[PDB]
Structure 1
Amino acid sequence: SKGEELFTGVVPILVELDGDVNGHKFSVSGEGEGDATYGKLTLKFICTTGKLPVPWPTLVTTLVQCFARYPDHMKQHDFFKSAMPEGYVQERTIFFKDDGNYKTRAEVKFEGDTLVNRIELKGIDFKEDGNILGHKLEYNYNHHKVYITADKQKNGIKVNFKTRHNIEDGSVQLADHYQQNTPIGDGPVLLPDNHYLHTHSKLSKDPNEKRDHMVLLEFVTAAGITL
């Protein structure tokens, strides 16, 4: 796709998120780069409003699937790049098992040479002693399978997946993600056959960063269509 040509090299990224979880407001800014040829993201995020009221790993999925590596035989199924530069709206509900949920709405698009992801998040019905507000999740991240199907009548896609977050005591907090993406522009997009993305992420810290933050290294590769 024409949009695909925008990802042939290293692309700078800006992320902005305004959140409100059980009335606790906060803001996060991130910057870094994506190299879709390798399916690779490197990003650093800061909470600019003070301490983050939720654990960092709960925000990873919210905080640019246009950087996925699509193998050559699957390039016709890459909705995300095909929507660029005009971009797409990405909406989710994330249901944390036995706990509250996030609803998110984001716009992902190019502004000059930069891929921007701007997001609004609202969290409700969380338990004060739960694993989220109680900060009981370990600072790490698992590997997931992100399922994608077409939504032709909206000229977009529907996406679903579950993430697994290690809890300090050895149990696992599940989060069911249900997601919809729509193009911002009117132009044609690639509507894919059913497939999925493999993800894996490493979370770390900057030893010189005093603010509450998260350093992230992530790899995303499309699969599920046979070669």
Structure 2
Amino acid sequence: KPDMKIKLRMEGAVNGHPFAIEGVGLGKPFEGKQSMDLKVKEGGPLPFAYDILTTVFNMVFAKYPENIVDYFKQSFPEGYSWERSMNYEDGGICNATNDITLDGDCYIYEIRFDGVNFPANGPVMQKRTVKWEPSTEKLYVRDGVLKGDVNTALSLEGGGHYRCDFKTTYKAKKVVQLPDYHFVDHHIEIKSHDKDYSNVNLHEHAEAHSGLP
């Protein structure tokens, strides 16, 4: 349990063109770190910026302090699922779902990803994104369900940023104690990749906190 495995498959489409990606990786749930290797199995070479997928490729790998209820770790071995809409400032929209289950010492994700209305001359279809900036998600309860909101941005090639609003709903398969309003800091990073992003090495890191004291 201090060190775990991940294997995943994402099937989806962007602007109506389908693709599928599989990933293997591992992380340290108490340290709030994870890493993975993904390879495109269908729809390659991908005609859109890979960065729109990386935040879809699991909060159980977040470091939670003692004084904040950890909804995600407490959700296992049964697991949880999440749904997310990602609204980019030029009207591109990505909807994603992930069902996270646990197999002994391996989390397996079934992921669906669907993006529409990305303009041909925009940074996503023209692959002008560089990386996601570090972000701060706010988590809160709404009608007995845990939600997460974060407004973040991608840095662009010629400088400047491309904004996106995330709205996530988290659903444990069993009743879990709900946390108070709190935050989770994120840093997601693609360390290595081949020319057309057929191979991607992705690292993410996060920690929950309670904001300015």
TM-score (norm 1): 0.87
The 3 A distance-change label for structure 1 pair 143 and 83 is same
Q: Secondary structure of 2:67's partner?
A: helix
Alignment map for 1:124-143 (pairs within 5 Å): 124-138=116-130, 140-143=131-134
Distance 1:202 1:61 in 2: 9
Who is 1:38 aligned against? 31
2:50–2:197 CA contact under 8 A, matched in 1:
no
How far the C-alpha of 1:56 sits from its partner, in A, is: 1.5
Give aligned-pair identity as a percent.
Answer: 25
Who is 2:85 aligned against? 93
1:79–1:189 CA contact under 8 A, matched in 2:
yes
Distance 1:107 1:26 in 2: 19
Who is 1:150 aligned against? 141
Structure 2 spans left out of the alignment, 5+ residues = none
1:24–1:53 CA contact under 8 A, matched in 2:
no
How far the C-alpha of 1:26 sits from its partner, in A, is: 0.6
How far the C-alpha of 1:12 sits from its partner, in A, is: 0.3
The 3 A distance-change label for structure 1 pair 210 and 145 is closer
Distance 1:210 1:129 in 2: 19
CA RMSD of aligned residues (A): 2.0
Aligned length: 212
Alignment map for 1:66-85 (pairs within 5 Å): 66-74=60-68, 77-85=69-77
The structure 1 residue matched to 2:45, chosen from 32, 40, 51, is: 51
1:19–1:122 CA contact under 8 A, matched in 2:
yes
How far the C-alpha of 1:204 sits from its partner, in A, is: 1.7
Distance 2:74 2:49 in 1: 33
Deviation track 1:116-147 (CA, whole Å, cap 9, x = no partner) reads 12111111112111111121112x33210011
Alignment map for 1:63-212 (pairs within 5 Å): 63-74=57-68, 77-138=69-130, 140-153=131-144, 156-184=145-173, 187-205=174-192, 212=198
2:138–2:149 CA contact under 8 A, matched in 1:
yes
**Paired amino acid for 1:222:** A
2:45–2:196 CA contact under 8 A, matched in 1:
no
The 3 A distance-change label for structure 1 pair 206 and 170 is closer
Deviation track 1:77-130 (CA, whole Å, cap 9, x = no partner) reads 211111112111210110011131001111012122211121111111121111
Q: Secondary structure of 1:131's partner?
A: coil
Structure 1 spans left out of the alignment, 5+ residues = 1-7
